[PDB]
Symmetry: C3
Subunit: 169 residues, 3 copies
């Protein structure tokens, strides 16, 4: 019944030690809160806004760590270096557009600037990958929008096969 979760902070500023990772730290707290998801933090990493590093991390976390859930924070806006959604599209097997939609409607309710977020959500093996905004406020609000559906989503994926492992098994 355990939920093993990874939080991937995608941020040049945090990577360069220019700012504290308020968003990522807060997501670790939200994830572990027994009144919320009641999950376990199994992976945490800060990476720069660089497609290959994001992709490699996601693949490792899905295929080697077999996490149930990865929450990315940052790299989903219009700034030129923001490529988290692009990295995510390259690693997912099955897209989950309803989750990206739920987050966008929720965000638009807060502000029209919500349409400047470009998140992708999708599945790889047993892992649900969710792109969240970079700000603490934004990532918390978006986590809140999807939380009601997370336990069931994770449950449906628990027995999925990790494709790269299954071929030599």
């Amino acid at each position: 019944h355990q939920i093993r979760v990874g939080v991937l902070t995608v941020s040049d500023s945090c990577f360069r030690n220019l700012a504290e990772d308020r968003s990522g730290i807060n997501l670790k707290d939200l994830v572990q809160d027994p009144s919320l998801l009641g999950g376990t933090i199994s992976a945490y990493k800060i990476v720069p806004d660089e497609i290959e590093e994001i992709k490699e991390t996601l693949i490792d976390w899905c295929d080697e760590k077999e996490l149930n859930l990865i929450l990315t924070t940052g790299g989903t806006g219009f700034a030129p270096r923001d490529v988290t959604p692009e990295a995510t599209k390259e690693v997912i097997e099955r897209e989950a557009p309803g989750m990206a939609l739920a987050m966008l409607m929720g965000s638009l309710n807060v502000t029209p600037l919500g349409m400047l977020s470009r998140p992708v959500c999708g599945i790889r093996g047993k892992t649900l990958i969710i792109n969240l905004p970079g700000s603490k406020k934004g990532s918390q609000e978006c986590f809140q929008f999807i939380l009601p559906a997370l336990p069931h989503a994770i449950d449906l994926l628990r027995d999925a096969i990790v494709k790269v492992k299954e071929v030599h098994d």
Copy 2:
């Protein structure tokens, strides 16, 4: 100018005769109701949750049967075998994201679990393909969400070319 419709049930359980196809049978009734769509059922099949069989059936129904509308039911959730949207993306020529959106907003209005549905809608030749959920309740509600736009959508596609046929024409 009849509306020729195909209902494709994607279900391992129904395919193996473990359960009755409540969803598909109900969709046949909804399609044919003269107060609703007033369509004709021109094709009906139960297939397992297997990407190639889904793809092959959709292609035959669009290119050989030249159906105006295909309603798929099942294989659109998070369960590992659910690959209907993936099959659909491989066969469509032009995506219709507004229809997938309309269904998802309607569904989210019923329950946040609507974000665990992953439907694709799109066009191939004269055919509009709509992915609906596997459950009778979900497919009925989703059919209702798009019904007001179906007649006009179908009309706009009636004179489309079937690409594989036109090359030897």
Copy 3:
């Protein structure tokens, strides 16, 4: 910090001189209104509903003209020749699904027929590309739905690199 905008009218009828481009002409007025966007019209063209012509124009306007914003009007519905979204998907580097969403929700609030529009929004270099409907009413409404986010989106993209130019720089 001018906003250099292109308006691309995709319309067989206008291209063949059968109708006046009411939509494109109105978009030029909207764009230049200082209480709306305060933009500059830097490019305007009417092209037929042909994928290659649309793609070639978009690439030229992004890569050679380095426009901040391109509004396309027409070619986004279900009619068989409507291929603007497909051309757009072939040229963008980063999709902006939030903006497409916002336009569609707004449109669905007016009529369910909004779900028969298939717009794509995305980014190439410094340029935001927005697909709008062909009708004057539809393009004006869709522009007005996204307008609140336009200034900030454009600003975030101002220092983006034009990839084809950077490689020989």
